[PDB]
Design a protein around this nucleic acid. Structure first.
Length: 165
RNA sequence: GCGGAUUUAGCUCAGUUGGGAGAGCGCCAGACUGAAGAUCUGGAGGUCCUGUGUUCGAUCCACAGAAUUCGCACCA
RNA sequence: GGUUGCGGCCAUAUCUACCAGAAAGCACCGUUUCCCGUCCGAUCAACUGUGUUAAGCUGUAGAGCCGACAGUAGUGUAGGGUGACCAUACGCGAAACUCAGGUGCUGCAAUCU
RNA sequence: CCAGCAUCAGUUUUGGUGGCAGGAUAAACCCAUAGGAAUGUAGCUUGCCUCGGUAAGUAUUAUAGCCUGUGGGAAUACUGC
RNA sequence: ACAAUCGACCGAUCCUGAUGUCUUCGGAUGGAUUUGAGUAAGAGCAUAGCUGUUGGGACCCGAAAGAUGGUGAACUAUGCC
RNA sequence: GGGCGAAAGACUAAUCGAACCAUCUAGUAGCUGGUUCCUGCCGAAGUUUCCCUCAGGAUAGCACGAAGCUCGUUUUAUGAGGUAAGCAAUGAUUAGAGGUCGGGGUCGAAAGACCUUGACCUAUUCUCAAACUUUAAAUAUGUAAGAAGUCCUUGUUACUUAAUUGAACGUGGACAUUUGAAUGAGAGCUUUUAGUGGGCCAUUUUUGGUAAGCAGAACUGGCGAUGCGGGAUGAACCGAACGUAGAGUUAAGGUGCCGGAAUACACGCUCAUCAACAAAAGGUGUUAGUUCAUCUAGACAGCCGGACGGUGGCCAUGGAAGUCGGAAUCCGCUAAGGAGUGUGUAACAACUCACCGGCCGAAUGAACUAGCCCUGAAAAUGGAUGGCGCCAAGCGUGUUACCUAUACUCUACCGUCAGGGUGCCCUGACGAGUAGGCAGGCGUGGAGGUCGUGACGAAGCCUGACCGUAAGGUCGGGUCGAACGGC
RNA sequence: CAGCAGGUCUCCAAGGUGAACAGCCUCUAGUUGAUAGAAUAAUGUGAUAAGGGAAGUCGGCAAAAUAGAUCCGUAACUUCG
RNA sequence: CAAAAGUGAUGUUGACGCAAUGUGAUUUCUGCCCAGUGCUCGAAUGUCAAAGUGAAGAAAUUCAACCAAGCGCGGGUAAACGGCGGGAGUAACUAUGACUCUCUUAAGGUAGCCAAAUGCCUCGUCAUCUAAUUAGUGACGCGCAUGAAUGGAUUAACGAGAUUCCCACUGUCCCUAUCUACUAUCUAGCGAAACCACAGCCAAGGGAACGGGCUUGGCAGAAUCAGCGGGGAAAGAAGACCCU
RNA sequence: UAAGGGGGGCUCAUGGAGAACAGAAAUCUCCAGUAGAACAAAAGGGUAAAAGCCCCCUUGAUUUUGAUUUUCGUGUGAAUACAAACCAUGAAAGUGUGGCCUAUCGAUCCUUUAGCCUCGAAUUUGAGGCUAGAGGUGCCAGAAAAGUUACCACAGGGAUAACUGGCUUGUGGCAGUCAAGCGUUCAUAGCGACAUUGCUUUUUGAUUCUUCGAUGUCGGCUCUUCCUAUCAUACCGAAGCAGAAUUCGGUAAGCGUUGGAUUGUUCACCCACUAAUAGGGAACGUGAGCUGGGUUUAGACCGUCGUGAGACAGGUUAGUUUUACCCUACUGAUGAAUGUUACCGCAAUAGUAAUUGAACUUAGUACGAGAGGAACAGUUCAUUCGGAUAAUUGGUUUUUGCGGCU
């Protein structure tokens, strides 16, 4: 499984706190970054990395894009004039099959029967309209996140359409 | 389908159809010895399986239950 | 002209600020041997005192609540295209957003005018 | 005896060519006249620089857009012959 | 047991529109009520014959296997001298 | 099941873990295989309640066979999503700030006092959920009712009922008529003698691995039991229905050529043989539209200069020098040089210039949007991304001509049955086909019958003619030396 | 089963060479089978040889050293055979 | 131990023996256990098979239902089968646990030996050998899980049985050649064998799924004999895996 | 057995506000709020008119029934008016066959008992058919009670598997590359946080799609192909490289690509050289050419597990390679077609051959601190292959001659 094979979803929803026999740990370090304070305060300009598609942005790549852009935005300042968000969470626990095997095995591990994707990963859904990487950035001079949206969509499956918001 | 043994102080058990119970090992504290052992003293530790009766009086006798243990018969 | 009851009936029938009326009719004021009840006067009781009370109404817009014109997504029966989607036959077409609006409806019973 | 297929003479059904017309309509292959708005080409004159051209006047050489008024043209979707 | 009384149902009765025939009888259909009555309402038995099947030479074919009675120590395991 | 063992069930007529021969015996096989005329009428199903039940079968779903009869198109409503859309409620987290108490710091013997980073609330700012839903379609569907004729008054009797409700009869009114002839089904119910009881694929959505054909639930078409055309090869798709034939007209789709039909017409980017997969990420091929900086107020390029005085401006620092970091932000000479575009030495030492100067004299350049191109792209038998090969014989947009399904379509003919009236004729609707049933037709051995034919030549052998519904039988020739059919 | 490369009790004992009954070789004494000729590939069936001395192959498998008579000379340790 | 029973083997053997089982000559020796189970032995003491209530007169007859053993309980015995511990603390100094405490059970092992026909961990750890050498041979301790009678241990002779070093050496190979016997080639005679798919190119393409056989394209003539092991998959039996 | 019926009375959990007390509070209270508390046991669900709180007395855990309907094919089950039976409660109205909606068990066979309708001259009685109850048949719709199974026989089965081919690339490899970091300054001499997109089919497997009248294994010998994801040979360019040592990239598949030791063995792991010792697929040519060490049964033993016969995802000892290629691939040799034809040359075409090092010698020159020692010539030969190969080599030569023993 590369993130080529963490693209779409015939994995249907499954995400509540009541009905769950415990989720694994995530990678996710921080949501809002640069400014914590200013959402639309200092920043009347935004770029949204709006999805064309209805994909699962897996928690693997979710931290990846965000941490590349974290390390990058220290040169300009470690709290420069941007506001890189994480939005929609891994609420849904990503079900992934295997260890599997029909005959000739330890106990037999099935696949077909034993259809339950035995909980391995975590993934967020980033459907149409939705974004994770909302970048509220400054009006004049230092806009830095247009560049840092190549670095956002790279660590993301799919072909996201860049919309000025 | 029908009968026998056992239940007592923590643990090991002594011992009993009416005047109402007994010692070791252990536990503690003080003597004692050059010290540990040994042993006395003092502290104690149970209403003798349990519910309810009989009697002047009950561990003890009665009706009935809990529970460990043991045997024959079953239909063939 | 009014007062009281029975409602049917639930969120356009909901709440606050604040005013105002008294014996046709209503409600507070105040207290108890003995029945009757207890923790306690919650059964029962004169002339009078009085709007405290509660049902009700006026004054009132602060809020529940509410609305054109207009703008618009999906889509059966089908019919045209695309990798992670987009666009059409043909029949209908919202919230969001707004000119603006707003103090119920209806039937029945008793009594005075 | 059905199908293919049959002398010789006359006729139907269905569609088109070509010639012509009605419903109903007037643009045209291309159609008059008067007044006002416009502005293209040829020829002449004048001015200025330069050897190659350009600007202004030219209704007084010749001709037009678009509108208004008056007057006159006008064969065809459909449908039939 | 009589019978009273209810039921599948037969037969009667009543009504709608068309309706032969008339202000009088007669024919048929659909639905419903009322009312009278009978049969285990199955209202004959026998027979040539047919059907699918239980059974019957049992559609044709492919096995491992039991009980009973014979014959083999001619070869061969063992015995003895 | 005994004989026998130092063991290996070695051994016993090639058979020994129970000798061999014969009989009962054709033991039996819940499993598998094989299995004999034709046409016509006509023809499904792979689904289920349920089982010590599973390659089966009682029952049910669906059409067998036979007799007697059986729609809807759509109008009025009534019941049910929460798709839609959302964060009220509940669920999971991102933001500003406000601020009790708590926590930290400091002065204090513990005790006491002074400050301050984190709270609900709440205002402002912003994320968001299969067991989370305030509001709540078109469109399909149920259930009831209607388009296709029933409503209402008065009086009496019996039940219910001691009131009253509900119904039928008596009785009045509302509610259509002339003329001629006569009754339609595309759906219900009953019942004898079979079959299925194991299927495939395409479209679409769900739970679910969108890594995979993992695996399950809903809904729909064709095949199963279907002609023919299209597609190089391929049941499902497209067009679509078939008994039997030639015409009349055209679908789905084709016309440079193998192989029939334009080397056509008009306009156009592009000519790479594009046509023939592919993202991040990127480009002076090449064209168009829109907006704007910019322009005789001298756009822009090349070539050519002034590289100035204050001055090493100031300050990071060991040193900082325009040339480290950071701020002031000028004066100068007021037709230009900023307190600076790029290079260079630790650095000076050295060098170049946007800013800007001087020649020249017209449309140039940034964005923004669209199209053709173009870069990213590796594997083993002989073209291998077409055979010949095509630069238009590619492709878009607009047009025209030619070709095109047993369907479409003309008319006749073949199959059973109905009605009118026998003898049967008119004539409706349909006719691809496997199980299966019924009907009809051809069939052997044999026979009650048996006459007829025969030795002047019977069956047979062999060979020819040889009707037409698929089934197989009459006549005729060469020849036989006794058998066999009218009815 | 066989006109089959077979099973099959069991008798007799010369010369010289080598213990005997190995081998060697003649007697008394016997005999070459129910098809044949000529050449004599590839390939399967026999021996020889330079140089090397284990280097090769599952594989000292295969193949090599040596050998008699008579005399000399010779190892641990014993259940002391 | 055979046989239905008669009748015998065992056996005219007899404990100096007969037989089932365990076993193996030689030579030095043999520590310890009664929970669980069998065999054998023993008597203090507990249980299991032979009643009698009811019908003759308007309500007043008759006969069918407890006692013994093994067992319970107690005693003998392991050449019949079986059994032989955990947690915690502790010595100069890296480093270790003599000894001690505590829990648990019926109660916790000697003489002698070790990395196995048995070792997860392990190219463990060390010496010597080898062009590399883990074998040869030298030990290490880090025993997943050694231990005295269906026996440890002393210890000579013998083998178509099992490894290595060492000496001479070897067609096995390097390295193949040459010559020879017999046949193949070729011929005569008589005369087999199980044995009967229309058919017999390759590259690309579709596909009952790896085609000479089907779609296109390239290629493909016949009379005849000797050769050689690649496919089709020969000669054949209803597969060896695998499930009913 | 009240943890039921009926009457009568009441509205919370909880918070704020403190009160001597207080420990949150105990008890209480003013003030505010109202189905969020309470629910056998789970989840949903009902509910203030109370299904919650509070107090007393009652015994319906009820007889005899059922119109009209639920409704499964069935077995089997529910709603169920209404009337009588009929006791104690209430002023009466009043509503229920014990229950807030909301899982909670056993037949035929049987067993034994109570209630009491049908019988052999015939007075009794034997024998036999409603109903209700005993009894962990949990699969809730139910036969005392345990099995290895390999000497081996027979009939069937991808109804079912080892495993093959297909598919994806799961598990993952490679590259582009987002490029912040860090290497002396310094995103890319080099090193690369964090990882992803396309390709791909190698680590390593997901899947019963396609297969039981055969789908026989591994390392090597031998001989029959094609490609380059490139070790070496031809040709080129660049560096943070002084010549030269060192470091990196492009054009391009004709040819060359070792010898031994550890280990079954490529892997694992070491050595001696040599100019030096590559990558990938192809039924890895590959058991009717070949070995049968690696690799599907059968003597016997140990460890480990089970009452045991015996077993094991653990090891050890012996234990079947038969035969003549039908058709084709295919390598040699002959026979016949535009008169004929002994004899041989065009090249429209088919098959083929292949490599490297050292030495003489270039040169002691280029260039350098020092070790060192480049461009480029002419000349010769040694490993190795094929064809040619018969003399100076090495050997064989049964043909024809020579030595010894019975």
């Amino acid at each position: 499984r590369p993130a080529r094979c963490y693209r779409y979803q015939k994995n249907k929803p499954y995400p509540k706190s009541r009905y769950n026999r415990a989720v694994p740990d995530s990678k996710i370090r921080i949501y809002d970054l640069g400014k914590k304070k200013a959402t639309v305060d200092e920043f009347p300009l935004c770029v949204h990395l709006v999805s064309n598609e209805l994909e699962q942005l897996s928690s693997e790549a979710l931290e990846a894009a965000r941490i590349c852009a974290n390390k990058y935005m220290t040169t300009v300042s470690g709290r420069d004039a941007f506001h890189l968000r994480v939005r929609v969470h891994p609420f849904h626990v990503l079900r992934i099959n295997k260890m599997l095997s029909c005959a000739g095995a330890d106990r037999l591990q099935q696949g077909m029967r034993g259809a339950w994707g035995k909980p391995h990963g975590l993934a967020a859904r980033v459907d149409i309209g939705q974004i994770i990487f909302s970048v509220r950035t400054k009006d004049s001079n230092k806009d830095v996140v247009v560049e840092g949206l190549r670095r956002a969509r790279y660590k993301f499956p799919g072909q996201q359409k860049i919309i000025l918001s």
